[PDB]
């Protein structure tokens, strides 16, 4: 039993279930998402909520953040992901920005630090633009300039009292990069039947590969692309038959299925043709979270934030995630696998089982 891994699996399972809701909502749009990111934010939300509100979050996540033994398990998980032995870079930081004159429950600040290894930041939301800049700047710094305008105008106002954020940054280099010379434009077939010409990378190598079947009989390829540090990998999956929609896969997705893919892999020679892409999406998490049973936190008269403060009633006004990803050749006879149709991708830290990023590429 390895506690950091146990927590990583629960967090990933929850995060993938949230993605599933998002995918089903926007079935034909590009979606880049962070399962670990949403789990981190909801974990902090557990500490600030109480009563039935906290109970709904805990039921959905499958664990309680304040159980005896969670602090070191979480502390160690952070270290497992960010350790130099990974070679590939991962940086994750949690932060809480709270209205300065808001009276906090005693022992909250120490408790928050113990679990999230970050100190509570106090701002004045009455000076709207100032507070918005402070938060946006913090995020920009912690995502190395990639996410520069997290909170748009109107996202926060004078009635805002609390902002919870997780900044996640990943920089990896392929174990075997794609030859720059092999890249050229090829046709990608969109779900609506249209066709676009996009730059596609190509590489022949012995890849860890496996083929699964959906419960209704459609086979799909899963291929693993490891990063140079050997602890992180990107899995790409897509139906074999071009007539089968990607939704057939997103509907059966789970953290366990992803583990099963990795466990069933065999190193086989394959020619891989994969589109290079640069995606940025902002997803509203309100409906996906309500669908998983977290309804109270969004309601002015039902939400319970007494674990944070008794002073005044609070409620979640907005819950969203902004993610950005760029995939290219290099960073910082074999059967053919051509991703010239919508496909799924998953970035995973294999030792812990942490699903950091995932998404559906509907149009490169």
């Amino acid at each position: 039993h390895h506690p950091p891994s146990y927590v990583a699996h629960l967090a990933s399972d929850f995060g993938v279930r949230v993605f599933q809701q998002v995918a089903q909502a926007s079935k034909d749009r590009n979606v880049v998402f962070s399962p670990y990111g949403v789990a981190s934010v909801l974990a902090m939300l557990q500490l600030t909520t109480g009563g039935e509100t906290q109970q709904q979050i805990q039921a959905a996540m499958g664990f309680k953040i304040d159980d005896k033994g969670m602090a070191p398990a979480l502390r160690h998980l952070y270290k497992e992901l960010m350790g130099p032995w990974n070679k590939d870079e991962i940086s994750t930081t949690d932060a809480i920005f709270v209205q300065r004159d808001l009276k906090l429950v005693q022992g909250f600040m120490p408790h928050f630090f113990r679990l999230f290894r970050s100190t509570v930041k106090q701002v004045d939301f009455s000076e709207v633009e100032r507070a918005r800049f402070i938060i946006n700047d913090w995020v920009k710094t912690h995502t190395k300039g990639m996410i520069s305008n997290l909170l748009g105008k109107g996202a926060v106002d004078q009635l805002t009292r609390l902002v919870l954020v997780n900044a996640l940054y990943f920089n990896g280099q392929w174990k075997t990069p794609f030859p720059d010379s092999s890249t050229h434009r090829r046709l990608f077939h969109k779900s609506d039947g249209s066709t676009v010409s996009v730059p596609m990378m190509a590489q022949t190598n012995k890849f860890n590969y496996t083929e699964f079947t959906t419960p209704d009989g459609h086979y799909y390829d899963i291929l693993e692309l490891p990063y140079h540090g050997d602890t992180l990998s990107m899995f790409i999956a897509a139906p074999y038959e071009k007539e089968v929609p990607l939704s057939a896969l997103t509907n059966i997705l789970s953290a366990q299925l992803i583990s099963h893919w990795k466990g069933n892999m065999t190193r086989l020679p394959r020619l891989l043709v994969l589109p290079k892409f640069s995606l940025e999406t902002e997803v509203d998490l309100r409906k996906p979270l309500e669908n998983l049973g977290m309804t109270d936190m969004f309601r002015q008269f039902q939400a319970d934030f007494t674990s944070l403060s008794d002073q005044e009633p609070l409620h979640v006004a907005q819950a969203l995630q902004k993610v950005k990803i760029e995939v290219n050749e290099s960073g910082t006879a074999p059967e053919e696998i051509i991703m010239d149709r919508p496909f799924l991708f998953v970035v995973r830290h294999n030792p812990t089982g942490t699903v950091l990023f995932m998404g559906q590429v509907m149009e490169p």
Binding site: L168, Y169, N171
Partner: peptide, 5 residues
């Protein structure tokens, strides 16, 4: 790959 959330 470069990614941020």
């Amino acid at each position: 790959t470069v990614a941020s959330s």
